[PDB]
Amino acid sequence: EIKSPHEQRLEDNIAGKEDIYRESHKRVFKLLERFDGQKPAIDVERALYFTQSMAETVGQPLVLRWAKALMNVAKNITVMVQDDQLLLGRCGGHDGRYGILYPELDGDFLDIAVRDLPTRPQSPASISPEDAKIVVEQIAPFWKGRTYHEALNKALPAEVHKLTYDDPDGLISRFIVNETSSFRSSIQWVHDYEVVLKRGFNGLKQEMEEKLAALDPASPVDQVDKRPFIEATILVCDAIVLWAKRHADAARKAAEACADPVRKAELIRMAENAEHVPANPARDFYEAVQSQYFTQMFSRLEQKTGTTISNGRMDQYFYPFYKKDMEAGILTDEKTLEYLECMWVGMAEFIDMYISPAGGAFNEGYAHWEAVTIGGQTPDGRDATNDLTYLFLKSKREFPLHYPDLAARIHSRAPERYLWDVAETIKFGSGFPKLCNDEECIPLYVSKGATFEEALDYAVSGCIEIRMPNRDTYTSGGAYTNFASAVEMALYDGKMKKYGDVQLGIQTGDARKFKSWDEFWNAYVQQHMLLLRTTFIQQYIVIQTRAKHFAQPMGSVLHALCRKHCIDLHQPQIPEGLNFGYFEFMGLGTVIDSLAAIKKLVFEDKKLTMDQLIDALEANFEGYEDIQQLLRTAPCYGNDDEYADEIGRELDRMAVSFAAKYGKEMGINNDARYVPFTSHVPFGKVVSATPNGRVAWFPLADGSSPSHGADHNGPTAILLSNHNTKNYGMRARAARLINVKFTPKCVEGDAGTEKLVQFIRTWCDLKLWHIQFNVINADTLKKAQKDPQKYRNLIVRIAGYSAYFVDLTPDLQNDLIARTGHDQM
């Protein structure tokens, strides 16, 4: 057993050695050492001043109410300068790690959060007694009966509601057909940050002022629909500029108070940055970073974007500034890294807080996906690797936090040097970068109306989604659907052991009496299709309800189509826009292996009856351990085994075929996707023992990865099984998340790096959308479990993101531990 660089850095931590890269990243190491190990605090300032303005503007158009509320935040929120920081911009008054509150989304959870957040098993957070008082006395009262979650809970018909929530108020999910619009303002998103760098918000404001002056004063559409949108974007331009200007004043005040002449000069430079950007076009690399940073941070104040607002193709839109400053002799590669890593530290201090229980369970370990995209192709079809591409990879290797959410684009002509550096970065052993395959998503997107130019220029967004920031217009959170519960409902006449005698699914009969595979298969299909009908019905209601509760004036002004047609992003239909939505197929590996065990062992080979099987399941395999071992011999997904994989291909076909038929009457693509967040942990907690040998309440298979320990034929067979369970003749599909784990010995040395490169090129050829890797020894995870304080800095890749292992619940830790660690390729 050899150790990954990450495991060696952990050993150095335990010994007390200074990190080997600390001396070349000294400023940002001093920065991150100040908030290491602290539980984040809830900050109420954004929520307070947002609510105070919204309470005064009831009746006015929502997009204009939003811009007025953001101006009230900009004028009143605490502004500060952090010691040794080179960047300005923060979303609260708290030092260290902090999250903020969005009462417009889930304000009906504020009393629960005030009591239960500091001790929650997933991602806890503290709140001071004074801030708790402000929450329950000044923020929560106005939002009673006005939150999006309250409106969604009341809008769902009873038959849908019973598969969505366990209680009449919607405070507890059943994790069957799980709505996700209630614990984030929208799905993932990427702003067009380059238009800010090239024109500033003054340029955008001027463009919108020209549209205001061109309105027909007699046109009711111009005056009632377009004017409040236009006035909202103009006001939000002023709001972010004022907010930046307040940061400039704070830096000047800190400069005068500081006797150190060097730090005094830095503070003045920072004050001058904030006085120029994001109002005006950036003039160098330092201004470009500060301008982008102001925009993404102010975005957090605007709304709780799913996975936290993503950052786009930073190695492309920052490159002209980097190249000019390098050639002029005013920038170095080390100073470039220092600017970027100050941005990472600031993003690491902002925690995207989910205050509801389902929100917390979906986002273990303070989960975040502020996707930063590098590599790929230019809008005119050339490779886009540049010097910045390699600096981002270098930063992720040496900067010790699991920030940023680095995502590398792969295409069939990606340079050898680029793929080699990507493979070596993966071998550092913290999960970075995740890979997105141009060859899979670009033909899907041009088929669905995108031009090649805008498809080639896509940014990674969130987990592994893609965005065209001036063409994408769909923002509604999708359903997460538990198809493992369909297996259980097919066994127990549409009931689930977790919920006892609640009639959840179709009454498909006593599975003990089933006499053929055709009979049990027909029973599963009826529950499978019920989950699909429920999924799309739920989504249609979500789309209509979100349009009455959310607005995004700054994000809209950064969108060319919203500027052209003068309509806010969260409306269901924007002219010329393309709408890419999703529903989640959760538990694919669990469903395939369960159905294959029944088909093979019960009906084909007749090694046991339905009665013996269900006896073992209801006993949770207690007293039936020989049966549990037998069930684990059936064909399983992730082994290139056609017996299992054709079942999974039919499962996928049903979902995609349904998506193809019923998306269009909702006016969107609502495509089948296999990206789990950490929802496979609570989805597993509600599913009892399954015919694949999985014990009750154990996590489901993650993403489209094989079930834990079911992949016995090497890592490449995982890729082949993924291909074999897809339907490339149809298009109503989106990403699949693949988690693969190697040991460090498996990819040791340059020979191991070359093996990983070829693994990636095979993955690319197969048109698989996503892949990411853990490179870790099994003993590291077990030692971290036994002594969490000694291994508190252990970072592992979970689901599109990495987190500290000790921050994960035991269930999610068991998921990571039970994933097969491949010792050879």
Numbering used by the authors: 6 to 830
The authors write:
Desulfonation of isethionate by the bacterial glycyl radical enzyme (GRE) isethionate sulfite-lyase (IslA) generates sulfite, a substrate for respiration that in turn produces the disease-associated metabolite hydrogen sulfide. IslA belongs to the glycyl radical enzyme (GRE) superfamily, which performs diverse chemical reactions under anaerobic conditions (Backman et al., 2017). As is the case for the core architecture of all characterized GRE eliminases (Backman et al., 2017), IslA is dimeric with each monomer having a buried active site located centrally within a barrel comprised of two five-stranded half β barrels, anti-parallel to each other (β1–10), and surrounded by α helices. Gly805 and Cys468 are 5.2 Å from each other, competent for radical transfer from Gly805 to Cys468, and for the generation of a transient thiyl radical that initiates catalysis on the substrate.
During model refinement, positive difference density was observed in the active site that resembled glycerol, a component of the purification buffer and cryoprotectant. Due to the buried nature of the active site, substrate access channels and product release channels are required. To investigate whether other GREs have a similar channel to that of BSS, we ran an analysis of available GRE structures using the program CAVER 3.0 (Chovancova et al., 2012) and compared channels identified with the toluene channel of BSS. We find an equivalent channel to that in BSS in the two glycerol-bound structures of HypD and IslA. The lengths of these channels range between 14 and 19 Å from the active site to the protein surface. Residues along the channels are highly conserved in each of these four GREs, consistent with these channels playing a functional role. The products, acetaldehyde and sulfite, are released, potentially through a highly conserved channel seen in IslA and other GREs, allowing for the next Ise substrate to bind.
